[PDB]
Design a protein around this ligand. Structure first.
Ligand code: GTP
Ligand code: MG
Lengths: 172, 902
């Protein structure tokens, strides 16, 4: 089966595990249980050409439970950087994660995901992000709570990775 | 203990190649605690000495780097010398294996260099040792590239002042690095992978630049000037230039440099035109990024001194030349600059400056207007969710902002003028309509003679016209609801145009938004067309909409409904909810969420102005609705989400009717308690808090509500009593204390005199430690209000009772509360709570200050100081807090005291 290694990265409590565990058919996890090291989750996406499989390495965001930080990043073919739009601290640390990824993965395609865009008083606005100026980089507003643009990062990455810009998602 | 090497190899292999996620996780944990120990120095060294593959070496190098930064204090001083030599050896042998290993080793060397004072010495020695040898230059440049980056690193473990005095050194070594790089182009230099490294290094060193111009910039721009240049090197150079420009913007910085970068970028116009001519998109993008950086770097000097030095408007000219490129991703960049410019210009109130920039803005909008055009090849409506759609939305936002710097009316007019005299194809028409839709609501009303000419023009355009045009036109019509409102005669023709479009699938979503808006604006004029709105409600499922759109239609319908004569509101609302009711009854026998929400919105936005009777007009519907919701709630009792939506519906219904649901009350409460005992859906606790918000004041309800609370608290406590019962189920905490707060708000005595106040208070104290923000906010708010009710509303009858009741509930658990709060502030939670905790502590003081003093003393007595807080910081804290005459003081004290424990 056609599959890719995706390293999911971002500050603690930004909603990585919730995101992945939302994609794995389930409720909206209200609890915040910090990830220890990494949790690998297979995500299958049906396309007009067949099923793709993203092996999502959901890594920890907190320094205290990071584990093998860069140790997970090798062999990775793509990545998702996530942060909280209601916490500029998590947005400020994006280029650090970015540099962390780049130092191991030269120039893989990467999507920046501005999570929690359902919460009022958005401190980090979409019209401020200049992260995705480059070709291999993308940005998306997402909501693990309302499933807003939740499939889009994977579609963009899938398009970039397979090489078909007209790739589509189907069901199921 | 130390493991065997091949076991480590098993673990690495397993980590990187075991298809089973569990196995990967096991390996990750094992290798996790293989690091973190004392032995992985030796292990990683051994793994580096052996070379079976890239992965073991990578893990080893990464471990080394990780270990010298996660555990440097276990290192005996005199031995350090041997490590530097090791890393220098490894990186000397694993040179041409894989750059990731070299990178990890480079990181290791740098991180080691920064936090050991072998004064200085590392940079100059590394250079003087590895400079002449060319085959070593690649990893030498790597190190030098990563040294400034690791200064502001997260993993590093060093004092705050140390960074500032470390940064002072790199600024010293700057020149030497520049010389090295200038020497690195002499040898080699005819190799792109070398120049790219040179540019990366140069780029990552600009933040420390103090002077020097010289040949490196000239080369940097020459590379960008030449057409022969490859994409990679082009990107490298571009990034370098951008990094320089960005490095400048913060500091003033040094105009002799800025001038050189300015003219430097200015020389690139010809190369840009070349890049465009050959249709080399990469280079065009890079160039646009450079120009955008240039403009955004010198923004203030552009706006404050238009056409002077760094205020040369050739920059905007370059950006507008970029704006002229057919590709959208190109001009997608620089939107931020235009945003910033628009912002600054909004701040400014100057006629000449606006006059100066207005032209550039107009040109921009012209370009962006051209950009929103689809292909003539395009067929079907334009999808909002596609990338080009996103771009179009971004353009819409930007132009929606900027139009104040021109005439909204003027722009709208001259936009409409385009259609009149072309006459354009459908793509242009659609684009113009799209931009007009994004400006319509900003236009001056008294310009209505044009508007009505547009509206009337886009209401009677034929069906045969391209579907995209009709779609966008529908959106436009939707955006002119005010114009429709101020000219009533247009209402019936417009609706007829929207309803038609509602029956066509690919337009249905649009028409749904237009009708919603109108219904919300022409709220009073829609009284005649209500019967039509009901038929739209009966037929909502025939129009294949998104849930949101249908919900929108019903919302509008409700808003219109809320303004009908009082004697008809009941009838209409009844026949309105009847739809959802029948739909729900039908589903047995499958998700009922949609109709639940559809009911919810109706009840949410149906707020008729009524001088209270009794009776409320909407009270004759909850009767007809209750059995269905009850049944629905009983069926899908296990599905938290569906139960949540049902409780939401009930919530809005209650808040809609008000106190007129005393009959609905007891069955609902009974079912709540009955179901909650089986499935602890937190939404039940929230719902419960709303009833309290409506009936807490009513005598005769208080007892039943208390009984409800006591009934709900048992399984709640049982739920939270489990292992990690607070870490999990934080919404339970939140909603529990929401309910408790509402009790404290509407009915303090009833709770204060019950037997659940103490365990709830205990659970609050316990819940203080939870790292979850909504929950914590709820808990702290509850504590605040709970303590506050003992010193609130003295004028009120139950004050004395409440006062001593709180006194009793303070006699116990008070000390505990204070101590727990202090511990939580110091050790558990981040600073965002210190205000909330301060508000609690402040309330405790106003209840009984002299006892609070001793409580705080005792709390401070039992506080661990080590891992050291001194006297006169405990004393000053205690004094600051206890002598405070405002919560802000307590907060500041808490901050000052909290900072000590980091
Ligand atoms: N409102 C809202 N809250 C969210 C959203 N996504 C996550 N959250 C909340 O934020 C918390 C994030 O938890 P996690 O997803 O486990 O955090 P993480 O990203 O995995 O970070 P780690 O500690 O490194 O594992 C959850 O407890 C949610 O309650 C969202 O999209 N909207
Ligand atoms: Mg996680």
């Amino acid at each position: 089966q056609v599959q890719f290694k995706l390293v999911l990265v971002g500050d603690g409590g930004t909603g990585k595990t919730t995101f992945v565990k939302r994609h794995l058919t389930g409720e909206f996890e209200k609890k915040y249980v910090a990830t220890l090291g990494v949790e690998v989750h297979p995500l299958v996406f049906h396309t007009n050409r067949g099923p793709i499989k993203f092996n999502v390495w959901d890594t920890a965001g907190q320094e205290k439970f990071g584990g093998l930080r860069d140790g997970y990043y090798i062999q990775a073919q793509c990545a998702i950087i996530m942060f909280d739009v209601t916490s500029r601290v998590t947005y400020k640390n994006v280029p650090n994660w970015h540099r962390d990824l780049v130092r191991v993965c030269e120039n893989i395609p990467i999507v920046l995901c501005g999570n929690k865009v359902d919460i009022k008083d958005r401190k980090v606005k979409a019209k401020s992000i200049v992260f995705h100026r480059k070709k291999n980089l993308q940005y998306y507003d997402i909501s693990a709570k309302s499933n807003y643009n939740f499939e889009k990062p994977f579609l963009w990455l899938a398009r970039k990775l397979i090489g078909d810009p007209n790739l589509e998602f189907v069901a199921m | 203990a130390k493991p065997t090497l091949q076991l480590v190899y098993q673990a690495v292999q397993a980590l990187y190649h075991d298809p089973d996620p569990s196995g990967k996780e096991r390996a990750s944990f094992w290798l996790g605690e293989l690091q973190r120990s004392v032995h992985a120095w030796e292990i990683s060294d051994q793994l580096l000495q052996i070379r079976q593959d890239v992965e073991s070496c990578y893990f080893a190098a990464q471990t080394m780097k990780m270990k010298i930064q996660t555990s440097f204090y276990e290192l005996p001083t005199d031995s350090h010398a041997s490590l530097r030599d090791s890393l220098l050896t490894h990186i000397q042998n694993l040179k041409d294996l894989s750059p990731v290993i070299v990178t990890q080793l480079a990181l290791a060397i740098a991180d080691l260099a920064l936090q050991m004072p072998s004064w200085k010495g590392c940079v100059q020695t590394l250079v003087e040792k590895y400079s002449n040898d060319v085959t070593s230059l690649p990893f030498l440049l790597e190190i030098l590239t990563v040294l400034p980056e690791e200064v502001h690193s997260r993993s590093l473990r060093i004092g705050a002042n140390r960074r500032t005095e470390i940064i002072e050194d790199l600024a010293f070594y700057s020149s030497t690095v520049v010389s090295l790089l200038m020497t690195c182009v002499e040898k080699a230099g005819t190799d792109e992978k070398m120049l790219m490294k040179v540019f990366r290094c140069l780029g990552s060193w600009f933040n420390l630049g103090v002077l020097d111009n010289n040949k490196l910039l000239a080369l940097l721009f020459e590379v960008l000037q030449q057409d022969k240049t490859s994409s990679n090197l082009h990107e490298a150079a571009s990034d370098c230039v951008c990094s320089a420009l960005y490095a400048i913007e913060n500091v003033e910085t040094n105009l002799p440099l800025a001038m050189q970068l300015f003219q430097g970028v200015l020389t690139l116009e010809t190369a840009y035109h070349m890049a465009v001519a050959r249709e080399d998109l990469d280079k065009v993008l890079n160039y646009c990024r450079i120009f955008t950086e240039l403009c955004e770097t010198f923004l203030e000097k552009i706006v404050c001194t238009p056409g002077q030095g760094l205020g040369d408007l050739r920059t905007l000219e370059l950006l507008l030349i970029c704006a002229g490129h057919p590709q959208y991703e190109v001009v997608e960049i620089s939107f931020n600059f235009w945003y910033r410019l628009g912002e600054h210009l909004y701040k400014t109130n100057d006629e000449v400056i606006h006059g100066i920039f207005k032209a550039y803005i107009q040109r921009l909008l012209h370009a962006l207007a051209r950009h929103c055009q689809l292909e003539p090849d395009h067929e079907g409506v334009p999808e909002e969710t596609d990338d080009f759609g996103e771009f179009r939305m971004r353009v819409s936002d930007l132009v929606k902002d900027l139009i104040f710097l021109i005439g909204s009316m003027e722009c709208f007019a001259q936009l409409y003028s385009t259609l009149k005299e072309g006459n354009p194809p459908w793509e242009v028409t659609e684009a113009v309509l799209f931009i007009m839709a994004a400006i319509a609501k900003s236009v001056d009303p008294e310009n209505n003679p044009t508007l009505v000419e547009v509206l009337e023009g886009v209401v009677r355009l034929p069906e045969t016209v391209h579907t995209a045009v009709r779609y966008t036109s529908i959106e436009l019509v939707g955006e002119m609801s005010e114009v429709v409102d101020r000219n009533p005669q247009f209402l019936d023709p417009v609706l007829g145009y929207l309803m038609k479009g509602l029956c066509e699938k690919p337009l249905a979503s649009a028409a749904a938004k237009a009708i919603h808006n109108i219904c919300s604006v022409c709220r009073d004029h829609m009284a005649q067309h209500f019967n039509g709105l009901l038929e739209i409600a009966r037929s909502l499922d025939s129009f294949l909409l998104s849930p949101e759109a249908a919900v929108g239609l019903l919302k509008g319908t409700a808003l219109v409904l809320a303004r009908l004569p009082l004697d008809k509101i009941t009838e209409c609302l009844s026949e309105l909810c009847s739809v959802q009711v029948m739909a729900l009854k039908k589903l047995l026998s499958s998700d009922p969420t949609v109709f639940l929400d559809r009911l919810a919105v109706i009840f949410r936005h149906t707020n008729p102005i009524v001088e209270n009777g009794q009776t409320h007009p909407c009270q004759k519907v909850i009767q007809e609705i209750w059995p269905v919701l009850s049944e629905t709630l009983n069926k899908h009792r296990a599905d938290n989400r569906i139960v949540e939506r049902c409780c939401r519906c009930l919530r809005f219904a209650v808040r809609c009717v008000g106190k007129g649901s005393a009959a609905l009350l007891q069955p609902l409460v009974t079912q709540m308690v009955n179901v909650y005992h089986v499935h602890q859906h937190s939404c039940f606790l929230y719902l419960g808090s709303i009833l309290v918000d409506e009936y807490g004041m009513e005598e005769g309800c208080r007892q039943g509500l208390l009984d409800m609370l006591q009934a709900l608290c048992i399984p709640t406590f049982q739920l939270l009593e489990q292992q990690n019962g607070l870490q999990n189920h934080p919404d339970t905490v939140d909603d529990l204390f929401r309910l408790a707060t509402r009790f404290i708000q509407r009915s303090p005595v009833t709770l204060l005199r019950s037997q659940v106040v103490i365990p709830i208070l205990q659970w609050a104290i316990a819940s203080t430690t939870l790292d979850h923000r909504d929950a914590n906010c709820s808990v702290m708010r509850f504590l605040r209000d709970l303590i506050h009710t003992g010193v609130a509303n003295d004028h009120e009858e139950d004050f004395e009772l409440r006062k001593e009741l709180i006194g009793q509930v303070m006699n116990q658990l008070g000390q505990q509360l204070v101590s727990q709060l202090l511990h939580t502030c110091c050790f558990c939670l981040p600073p965002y709570t210190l205000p909330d905790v301060a508000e609690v502590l402040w309330e405790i003081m106003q209840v009984d200050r002299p006892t609070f003093c001793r409580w705080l003393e005792n709390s401070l007595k039992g506080l661990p100081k080590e891992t050291t807080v001194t006297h006169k910081q405990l004393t000053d804290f205690h004094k600051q807090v206890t002598s405070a005459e405002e919560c802000k003081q307590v907060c500041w004290a808490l901050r000052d005291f909290t900072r000590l424990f980091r």
